[PDB]
Amino acid sequence: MGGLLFSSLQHCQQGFVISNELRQQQSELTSTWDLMLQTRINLSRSAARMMMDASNQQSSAKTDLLQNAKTTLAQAAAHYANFKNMTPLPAMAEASANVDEKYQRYQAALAELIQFLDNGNMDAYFAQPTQGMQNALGEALGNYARVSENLYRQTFD
Amino acid sequence: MGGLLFSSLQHCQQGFVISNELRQQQSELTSTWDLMLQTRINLSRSAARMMMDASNQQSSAKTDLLQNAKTTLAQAAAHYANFKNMTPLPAMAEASANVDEKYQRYQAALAELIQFLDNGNMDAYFAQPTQGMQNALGEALGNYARVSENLYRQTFD
Numbered sequence: 001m002g003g004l005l006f007s008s009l010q011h012c013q014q015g016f017v018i019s020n021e022l023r024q025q026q027s028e029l030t031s032t033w034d035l036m037l038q039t040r041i042n043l044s045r046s047a048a049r050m051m052m053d054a055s056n057q058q059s060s061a062k063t064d065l066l067q068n069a070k071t072t073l074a075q076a077a078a079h080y081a082n083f084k085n086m087t088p089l090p091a092m093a094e095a096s097a098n099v100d101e102k103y104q105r106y107q108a109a110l111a112e113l114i115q116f117l118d119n120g121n122m123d124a125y126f127a128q129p130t131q132g133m134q135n136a137l138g139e140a141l142g143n144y145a146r147v148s149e150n151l152y153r154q155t156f157d
Numbered sequence: 158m159g160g161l162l163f164s165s166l167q168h169c170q171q172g173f174v175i176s177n178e179l180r181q182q183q184s185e186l187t188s189t190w191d192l193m194l195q196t197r198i199n200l201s202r203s204a205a206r207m208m209m210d211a212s213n214q215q216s217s218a219k220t221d222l223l224q225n226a227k228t229t230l231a232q233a234a235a236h237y238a239n240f241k242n243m244t245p246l247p248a249m250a251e252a253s254a255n256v257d258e259k260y261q262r263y264q265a266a267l268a269e270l271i272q273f274l275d276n277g278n279m280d281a282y283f284a285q286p287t288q289g290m291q292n293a294l295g296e297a298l299g300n301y302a303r304v305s306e307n308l309y310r311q312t313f314d
């Protein structure tokens with residue numbers, strides 16, 4: 001014996017196998033979130049430029065930042081697909097189902113804001129309560145993280 | 158049964174010591190980038206609102222938004238302090254170094270724009286090259302994730 005947080009190599013390797021998977025699935029959800037907030041930033045960046053005051057030229061001035069929001073949303077959907085494809089560990093089943101619901105709602109909302117700016121509808125872009133769908137997903141993400149944490153801690157025992 | 162990824166309980170334990178610290182480092186770094194990105198979305202949602210009410214809409218949430226970016230920015234810096242307070246691992250020292258530089262620089266970009274927006278000066282806001290610096294830190298963070306992953310893989314088979 002010369003081991004300390006684990007009762008045997010079997011136990012130790014067990015915890016590794018369980019944690020390395022939690023680590024993969026939490027990684028895809030960090031990237032999803034990152035590129036979804038990147039999409040909301042590019043959308044704001046497009047709209048401010050849309051809004052710069054030439055006269056009757058109106059709110060639609062050379063914005064290649066909307067294609068940029070279309071790209072970061074597609075990449076977040078790519079990271080999300082990997083997670084979605086990864087079946088929940090039993091203990092995780094419900095934390096993930098919650099993150100999928102809050103995610104389908106916030107991706108819809110961002111895709112909805114791209115079509116608004118795409119058709120020049122500024123008021124609809126400004127009026128969407130995007131912040132609540134984001135806060136909801138942020139809160140289902142910290143909960144999924146509490147629940148991985150708990151399972152991670154149960155390995156060194 | 159199975160097949161082992163570790164030649165002994167000490168080899169396995171040694172990987173856990175490394176991995177668990179890497180895990181913590183990375184948690185605070187992701188939490189810094191998150192909050193910096195919500196500061197950016199708060200600032201940009203305020204700057205688009207500062208340009209309204211001029212034959213266009215609502216405007217009034219732009220200082221709630223500006224007060225909320227001061228908070229996410231203070232939360233971002235407290236997270237980075239946790240990360241700075243941690244033991245830099247030899248394999249991570251260079252990556253860590255590159256992250257500090259780019260961090261320091263974007264935190265300070267963000268803080269100037271809060272100031273410009275407090276003064277109501279839109280022109281100062283758009284004259285600042287924020288996105289450059291944000292992409293710079295996204296890059297350094299990607300590299301750090303890349304070098305972090307390398308060290309973690311060598312912890313097993």
Ligand SMILES: c1cnc2c(c1)ccc1cccnc12
Nearest residue numbers: 015016019155172173176312
């Ligand atoms: C490498 C990486 N993670 C670990 C180990 C080795 C060993 C055990 C273990 C237990 C719980 C969580 N992670 C690990």
Ligand SMILES: N[C@@H](CC(=O)O)C(=O)O
Nearest residue numbers: 125126127128130131202
């Ligand atoms: N509703 C959009 C745009 C805005 O309010 O500025 C958002 O929250 O991103």
